[PDB]
Design an enzyme around this catalytic site. Structure first.
Site, mmCIF file in Angstrom:
data_model
loop_
_atom_site.group_PDB
_atom_site.id
_atom_site.type_symbol
_atom_site.label_atom_id
_atom_site.label_comp_id
_atom_site.label_asym_id
_atom_site.label_seq_id
_atom_site.Cartn_x
_atom_site.Cartn_y
_atom_site.Cartn_z
ATOM 1 N N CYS A 25 -21.379 7.254 -19.329
ATOM 2 C CA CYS A 25 -22.707 7.667 -19.825
ATOM 3 C C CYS A 25 -23.185 8.844 -18.998
ATOM 4 C CB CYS A 25 -23.635 6.374 -19.524
ATOM 5 S SG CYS A 25 -23.732 5.725 -17.800
ATOM 6 N N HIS A 159 -28.523 3.473 -17.537
ATOM 7 C CA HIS A 159 -27.530 4.152 -18.459
ATOM 8 C C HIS A 159 -28.277 5.426 -18.627
ATOM 9 C CE1 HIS A 159 -25.517 4.252 -22.264
ATOM 10 N NE2 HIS A 159 -26.423 4.545 -23.010
HETATM 11 C C1 LIG Z 1 -21.401 1.154 -15.539
HETATM 12 C C2 LIG Z 1 -22.997 1.747 -15.618
HETATM 13 C C3 LIG Z 1 -23.285 2.142 -14.007
HETATM 14 C C4 LIG Z 1 -22.832 2.782 -16.401
HETATM 15 C C5 LIG Z 1 -23.202 2.845 -17.870
HETATM 16 C C6 LIG Z 1 -23.371 4.147 -18.584
HETATM 17 O O1 LIG Z 1 -21.874 4.432 -18.939
HETATM 18 N N1 LIG Z 1 -22.654 1.773 -18.548
HETATM 19 C C7 LIG Z 1 -23.121 1.219 -19.688
HETATM 20 O O2 LIG Z 1 -24.163 1.651 -20.183
HETATM 21 C C8 LIG Z 1 -22.098 -0.016 -20.328
HETATM 22 C C9 LIG Z 1 -20.828 0.833 -20.514
HETATM 23 C C10 LIG Z 1 -19.582 0.261 -20.128
HETATM 24 C C11 LIG Z 1 -19.628 -0.948 -18.846
HETATM 25 C C12 LIG Z 1 -18.894 -0.511 -21.397
HETATM 26 N N2 LIG Z 1 -22.556 -0.489 -21.415
HETATM 27 C C13 LIG Z 1 -22.378 -1.492 -21.900
HETATM 28 O O3 LIG Z 1 -21.459 -2.418 -21.380
HETATM 29 C C14 LIG Z 1 -23.029 -2.073 -23.207
HETATM 30 C C15 LIG Z 1 -23.035 -3.680 -23.343
HETATM 31 C C16 LIG Z 1 -23.082 -4.580 -22.206
HETATM 32 C C17 LIG Z 1 -24.465 -4.346 -21.187
HETATM 33 C C18 LIG Z 1 -23.424 -6.117 -22.724
HETATM 34 N N3 LIG Z 1 -22.517 -1.581 -24.357
HETATM 35 C C19 LIG Z 1 -22.709 -1.871 -25.670
HETATM 36 O O4 LIG Z 1 -23.500 -2.697 -25.711
HETATM 37 O O5 LIG Z 1 -22.084 -1.079 -26.470
HETATM 38 C C20 LIG Z 1 -22.618 -0.461 -27.656
HETATM 39 C C21 LIG Z 1 -23.006 -1.316 -28.877
HETATM 40 C C22 LIG Z 1 -23.951 -2.337 -29.065
HETATM 41 C C23 LIG Z 1 -24.471 -2.844 -30.108
HETATM 42 C C24 LIG Z 1 -24.295 -2.085 -31.256
HETATM 43 C C25 LIG Z 1 -23.631 -1.023 -31.381
HETATM 44 C C26 LIG Z 1 -22.902 -0.420 -30.266
#
Ligand SMILES: CC(C)C[C@@H](CO)NC(=O)[C@H](CC(C)C)NC(=O)[C@H](CC(C)C)NC(=O)OCc1ccccc1
Length: 212
Positions: A25, A159
């Site tokens: 991100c 994020h």
């Molecule tokens: C690791 C952090 C310090 C940095 C941030 C920015 O990359 N990470 C994130 O924002 C992470 C990304 C990665 C771990 C897969 N986000 C996530 O892991 C989240 C899900 C989790 C919180 C249940 N991603 C997620 O929900 O995917 C997107 C999506 C959801 C619903 C409909 C369409 C698309």
């Protein structure tokens, strides 16, 4: 400054990307700002490498998270390659900037928007896209399909995204979860709630690349 700002309308934002399952991100976020300022300065719109940032930022943690300001520092020193030259793999390998050849573009610096201040942020957005952070861990944010998002959400920012515009009652954000999320990959977050933190912590830390 104007009531409405949308950098997409000025030909300054590229297609919505998808970071996949990698905490990239911060890199995606910084790249949106870079693609935007170069277009504003030079007149050309190009996609730049998030993978390069992911691999070459020593202060960030690759797919485990990172900092938009440090990724923005790197580009101001060593520049950055086109996305086509140094594509995105969704995994952190080693820094290959030198191997790929001469950098495509280089910025002049990076500045920080005064935090917890809605006006300071809108002013900057009226000049160029801005790197912004928010709390995306909430279910409501994850399930967002459209509308001016008001929450609920806290301010445990986790994020990084980019602000590409605003309107009388919202701030337009470019996310990196693909076009299948939100309003074609975008989200309009409520503004002017008087909350200094901003909805979902939107005003915590915002940076933008400088380029003369
Ligand atoms: C690791 C952090 C310090 C940095 C941030 C920015 O990359 N990470 C994130 O924002 C992470 C990304 C990665 C771990 C897969 N986000 C996530 O892991 C989240 C899900 C989790 C919180 C249940 N991603 C997620 O929900 O995917 C997107 C999506 C959801 C619903 C409909 C369409 C698309």
């Amino acid at each position: 400054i104007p009531e409405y700002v949308d950098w997409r309308q000025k030909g300054a934002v590229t297609p919505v990307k998808n970071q996949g399952s990698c905490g990239s991100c911060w890199a995606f976020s910084a790249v949106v700002t870079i693609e935007g300022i170069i277009k504003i300065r030079t007149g050309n719109l190009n996609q730049y490498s998030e993978q390069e940032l992911l691999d070459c930022d020593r202060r960030s943690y690759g797919c485990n998270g990172g900092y938009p300001w440090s990724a923005l520092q790197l580009v101001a020193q060593y520049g950055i390659h086109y996305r086509n030259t140094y594509p995105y793999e969704g995994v952190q390998r080693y820094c290959r900037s030198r191997e790929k050849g001469p950098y495509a573009a280089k910025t002049d610096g990076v500045r920080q928007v005064q935090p917890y201040n809605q006006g300071a942020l809108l002013y900057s957005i009226a000049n160029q896209p801005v790197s912004v952070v928010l709390q995306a861990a909430g279910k409501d944010f994850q399930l967002y399909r459209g509308g001016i998002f008001v929450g609920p959400c806290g301010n445990k920012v986790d994020h990084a995204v980019a602000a590409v515009g605003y309107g009388p009652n919202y701030i337009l954000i470019k996310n990196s979860w693909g076009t299948g999320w939100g309003e074609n990959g975008y989200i309009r977050i409520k503004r002017g709630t008087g909350n200094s933190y901003g909805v979902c912590g939107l005003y915590t830390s915002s940076f933008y690349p400088v380029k003369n």
